Design a protein around this ligand. Structure first.
Ligand SMILES: Cc1cc2nc3c(=O)[nH]c(=O)nc-3n(C[C@H](O)[C@H](O)[C@H](O)COP(=O)(O)O)c2cc1C
Ligand code: SF4
Ligand code: SF4
Ligand code: SF4
Ligand code: FES
Ligand code: FES
Ligand SMILES: [K+]
Lengths: 42, 263, 429, 87, 212
């Protein structure tokens, strides 16, 4: 078919949809690198 | 051995790698005009008054930030360089207030002096000017922020030298403003130094206000006794009266700062 | 070849541009995404960079630098710091909305593009910076990214190739200047979106002070197809040094404003008529066209008759391809007002960091406001021209140039309209 | 920031009393050298001039600002404290 | 204004805290960035506070500065630089009409005029019932669907004065109108029938170069 819009999932997205996905992805991420200090002011 | 050769108006000069174009020029006695650059602060590169032509390069470079490359010929007085300075000076003065008679910086103002030496002699700005509300930051530093040219020297000094991150820029574009956002006093033992580094009369000494003009004061080079550091100072006097205290550069002591008590 | 256009569907890259097929992983794979990705990664960074080089691909974010050479600045040994790919999805140029379609309808092309482009650079992760207003689009991208992670296509041992690669989505907060590559990096680092001076270059000191490459969404998303189908396949489209296919946004006074994929060097007239339905009120009703987003100078109808849509042809016409956003103005348009509004846009978007744009663009805006009403003298036209030349080439970033060029385009091609407006005002007053 | 007033050597004399004029409050003086300031190309020239005129003197060695090591890229350091938090 | 003056409604003692579920979201946000560079999370975290609260009182800015150990001024700079942050309360629905040239050329003025007449406000104002705030914005990246508006997180596109009044009518009733174009087409494809991508897309491996 080529006559229907198939991007209707975003009609149900809410305020926290983006950050919930980010939280969900948190387990998959590789460990972050480290600059060696807690911040540039340390 | 590591030194590289660069040219300043055809004059050869040997510089360490990493030397900026502005630092190459001062090695032959040329002082590039500047506003945002201070050699004791981090490089900013935002005022654009230091733009200079490099021979064979279509684009002018910011001399204060651009590292000099081997074989470059820096044209500090070419037509392209002069027109770049005139353009930047024109933009700096477009919104600047007609305050020189009432402004304490008058007579020792880098904006006045570099306008005389590197800018045009007239205006073609036909619109109305920006006006900015004043911020109260304590009993020592008076702010007339319509005079501010957004050089960010005070912000960098506060964060880097005084270690206080209370100054910043709020807003965007032409309406970008330097201040604390909230009402807050910038009270630090080094706070008075932002008066010296501010190139304009945006930040001035509250105690000193309106009392003297720079051309009429006599300078006595002396020493501070408010502590045991022995900071080198200049005592401004007029007609037998002490009018203010200014830092005197001594690289091994107070480099060019003094404490608020000394000031 | 000497004629370019009529791109066939089999040669189009963004085959779900209009979102009429499943945009999720299953749909993406049925359309060829994520196919032999493992073989591409194991071919090596040098092979990938060669394929992008031979493709003749140039940046699609507005400036058009050769992509293969740009990405090769990263192809250097490690010095202890991580390496990053930053994908520019800020999509802020007025008239330009192409990257929006890629992100929401072909997200897996972008995700694969990050991995392949990331491999060629040696980068450990990709940060996709997407403008805050694109909330629904960013959420679509996050869903696609999660599918890739679950399928093992990204992350640890990505595509079973032994290469670890993360993909992070970071949202902007409303600022056109954050599309500028160094301002984008400053924004990711949690600062005001103010561009950095160069040097250093991002390939040396970039995001978090680490080697970085900033690439446009379209530039990244076409890379996996280039590796699959070959650089020579890409270079067979368009003129020499103007290779490939391009996404065009035709907006303004056309009958059917739309986004379409077409061959580079297609005639501008052909693009507007074949795909956009022609200029509103007929071709002869055309006044001026902004060929590549609000930052490129306008060109009059006479120039528009024969001009080709590619980097070199439009530079020869005293303008630029830019983002390939075609804004069409017919003769009913108040051309002076239309340009004045773009100057008002740049005045609102200037970051305020550096003097010529902070003060100059606002100054140009005030002069243009008076030029709209005729409330000026003709001698001010040359003054406005000179002011624009004092901004161009004197600022930290190219936003200053982007505000100067539209003014220059108006004075170059429509000076009589400006002068006529002034005569009318003076007579009335 | 201008450095053009730091090129030449100067010779000034010791400061002496100034008092308020009773009539107007103006600053009076009895020091005939209160305003005298001479300019010299080198410290040697200034020293020579003082010697032949019989003035005892003190010489202060010229203070030069030492060369700094400036680097814009240090504002964005990956792991050093030179990273700036604002621009 | 880009300066702050304490009021009874907006001062450091105004109450703001993140909910326990938002603290978990912050934890995942902060982990997206290298250790030693937590300041990178200021924008997403500051945006998160705006989503919980609707706008950013000075106390919300201070809280974010505390959590990420950045000076408050560096958060004030971010809040005042980026236009999507609301430093004053807005209405339940924030209507943002694009008026840049591409949308101007397709009569965004009519859309802006229709909203004002229906809501009985002017650009920049909030309705007395505090349901709607109206402002003009720059190009929203939906140029080919001009004229268009953003309401909160959603785009409404290909608008006409009647269409935007029916969207506002739905919002008043409490219903949620579906986003996207209102002229018939679904997204950015040309109206009157596709001029490309009519054929089915090729499958996996089509046109792949030999040796790969
Ligand atoms: C004011 C301004 C806005 C820009 N906006 C974008 C943008 O929204 N998207 C983009 O890809 N590039 C934008 N750019 C260009 C980028 O700075 C940079 O050239 C580009 O991301 C490089 O990617 P590319 O080589 O694939 O083209 C902008 C530049 C300027 C000066
Ligand atoms: S800062 Fe300088 S130029 Fe400005 S009013 Fe004061 S003296 Fe005049
Ligand atoms: S107040 Fe003075 S030092 Fe601070 S940014 Fe303005 S001009 Fe520069
Ligand atoms: S040109 Fe404008 S946007 Fe670019 S750095 Fe300068 S002030 Fe900021
Ligand atoms: S002194 Fe170089 S840009 Fe300011
Ligand atoms: S001009 Fe309105 S969305 Fe681009
Ligand atoms: K001062």
């Amino acid at each position: 078919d080529n006559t229907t819009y198939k991007n209707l999932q975003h009609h149900d997205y809410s305020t926290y949809t983006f950050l919930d996905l980010n939280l969900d992805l948190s387990k998959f991420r590789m460990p972050q690198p480290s600059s060696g200090r807690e911040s540039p002011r340390h | 051995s590591n030194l590289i050769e660069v040219f300043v108006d055809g004059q050869s000069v040997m510089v360490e790698p990493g030397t900026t174009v502005l630092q190459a020029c001062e090695k032959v006695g040329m002082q590039i005009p500047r506003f945002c650059y201070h050699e004791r602060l981090s490089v900013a590169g935002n005022c654009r008054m230091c733009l200079v032509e490099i021979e064979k390069a279509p684009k002018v470079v910011a001399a204060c930030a651009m590292p000099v490359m081997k074989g470059w010929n820096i044209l500090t007085n070419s037509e392209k360089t002069k027109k770049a300075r005139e353009g930047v000076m024109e933009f700096l003065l477009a919104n600047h207030p007609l305050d020189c008679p009432i402004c304490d910086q008058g007579g020792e103002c880098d904006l006045q002096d570099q306008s005389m030496m590197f800018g045009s002699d007239r205006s073609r700005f036909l619109e109305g000017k920006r006006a900015v509300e004043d911020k109260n930051i304590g009993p020592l530093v008076k702010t007339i922020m319509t005079r501010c040219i957004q050089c960010t020297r005070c912000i960098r000094f506060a964060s880097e030298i005084a270690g206080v991150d209370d100054l910043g820029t709020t807003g965007r574009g032409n309406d970008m403003q330097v201040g604390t956002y909230i009402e807050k006093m910038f009270m630090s033992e080094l706070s008075g130094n932002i008066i010296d580094i501010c190139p304009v009369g945006a930040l001035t000494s509250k105690p000193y206000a309106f009392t003297a003009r720079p051309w009429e004061t006599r300078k006595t080079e002396s020493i501070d006794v408010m502590d045991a550091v022995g900071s080198n100072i200049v005592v401004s006097t007029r007609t037998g009266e002490v009018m203010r205290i200014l830092p005197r550069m001594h690289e091994d002591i107070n480099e060019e700062w003094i404490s608020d008590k000394t000031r | 070849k000497t004629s370019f256009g009529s791109l066939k569907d089999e040669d189009r890259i963004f085959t779900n541009l209009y979102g009429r097929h499943d945009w999720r992983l299953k749909g993406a794979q049925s359309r060829g995404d994520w196919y032999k990705t493992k073989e591409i990664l194991l071919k090596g960074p040098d092979w990938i960079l060669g394929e992008v080089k031979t493709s003749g691909l140039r940046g699609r974010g507005g400036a058009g630098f050769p992509t293969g050479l740009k990405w090769s600045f990263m192809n250097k040994p490690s010095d202890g710091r991580p390496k990053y790919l930053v994908v520019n999805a800020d999509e802020g140029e007025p008239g330009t909305c192409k990257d929006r379609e890629i992100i929401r309808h072909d997200p897996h092309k972008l995700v694969e593009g990050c991995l392949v482009g990331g491999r060629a650079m040696g980068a450990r992760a990709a940060y996709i910076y997407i403008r805050g207003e694109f909330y629904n689009e960013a959420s679509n991208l996050q869903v696609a990214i999660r599918e890739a992670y679950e399928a093992g296509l990204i992350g640890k041992n990505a595509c079973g190739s032994g290469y670890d690669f993360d993909v992070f989505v970071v949202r902007g907060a409303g600022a056109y200047i954050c599309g500028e590559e160094t301002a984008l990096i400053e924004s990711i680092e949690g600062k005001q979106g103010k561009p950095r001076l160069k040097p250093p270059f991002p390939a040396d000191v970039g995001v978090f002070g680490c080697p970085t490459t900033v690439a446009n969404v379209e530039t990244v998303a076409v890379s996996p197809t280039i590796c699959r189908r070959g650089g020579a396949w890409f270079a067979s489209f368009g003129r020499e040094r103007n290779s490939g296919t391009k996404l065009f946004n035709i907006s303004g006074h056309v009958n059917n404003p739309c986004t379409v994929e077409e061959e580079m060097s297609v005639p501008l007239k052909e693009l507007i008529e074949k795909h956009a339905g022609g200029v509103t009120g007929g071709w002869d009703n055309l006044l001026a066209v902004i060929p590549g987003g609000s930052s490129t100078p306008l060109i009059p109808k006479s120039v528009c008759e024969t001009v080709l849509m590619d980097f070199d042809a439009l530079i020869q016409a005293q303008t630029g391809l830019g983002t390939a956003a075609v804004i069409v103005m017919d003769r009913s348009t108040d051309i002076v007002k239309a340009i004045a509004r773009l100057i008002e846009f740049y005045k609102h978007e200037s970051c305020g960091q550096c003097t010529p744009c902070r003060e100059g663009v606002d100054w140009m805006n005030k002069v243009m406001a008076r030029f709209v009403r005729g409330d000026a003298r003709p001698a001010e036209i040359d003054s406005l021209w000179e002011i624009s030349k004092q901004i161009e080439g004197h600022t930290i970033c190219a936003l200053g140039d982007g505000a100067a060029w539209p003014v220059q385009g108006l004075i170059r091609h429509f000076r009589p309209e400006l002068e006529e407006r002034m005569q009318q005002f003076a007579q009335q007053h | 920031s201008g450095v053009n007033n730091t090129k030449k050597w100067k010779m000034e004399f010791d400061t002496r009393e100034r008092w308020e004029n009773p009539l107007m409050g103006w600053a009076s003086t009895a020091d005939p050298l209160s305003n005298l300031v001479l300019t010299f190309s080198t410290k040697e020239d200034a020293v020579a001039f003082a010697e032949k005129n019989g003035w005892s003197y003190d010489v202060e060695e010229r203070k030069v600002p030492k060369p700094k090591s400036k680097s814009y890229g240090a504002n964005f350091s990956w792991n050093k404290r030179t990273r700036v938090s604002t621009k | 204004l880009f300066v702050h003056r304490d009021t009874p409604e907006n001062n450091p003692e105004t109450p703001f805290d993140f909910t326990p579920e938002n603290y978990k979201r912050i934890e995942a946000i902060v982990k997206n960035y290298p250790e030693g560079h937590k300041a990178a999370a200021v924008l997403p975290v500051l945006d998160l506070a705006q989503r919980q609260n609707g706008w950013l009182p000075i106390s919300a800015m201070n809280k974010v500065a505390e959590i990420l150990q950045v000076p408050p001024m560096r958060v004030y700079e971010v809040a005042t630089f980026y236009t999507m942050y609301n430093r004053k309360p807005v209405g339940k629905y924030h209507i943002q009409v694009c008026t840049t040239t591409p949308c101007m050329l397709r009569n965004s003025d009519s859309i802006l005029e229709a909203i004002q007449k229906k809501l009985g406000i002017k650009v920049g104002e909030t309705t007395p019932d505090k349901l709607f705030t109206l402002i003009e914005v720059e190009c929203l990246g939906a140029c080919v669907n001009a004229p268009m508006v953003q309401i909160n997180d959603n785009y409404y596109e290909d608008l006409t004065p009647k269409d935007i009044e029916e969207i506002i009518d739905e919002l008043k009733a409490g219903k949620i109108p579906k986003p996207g174009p209102r002229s018939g087409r679904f997204s950015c494809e040309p109206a009157g029938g596709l001029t490309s991508l009519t054929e089915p897309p090729k499958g996996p491996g089509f046109g792949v170069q030999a040796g790969l």
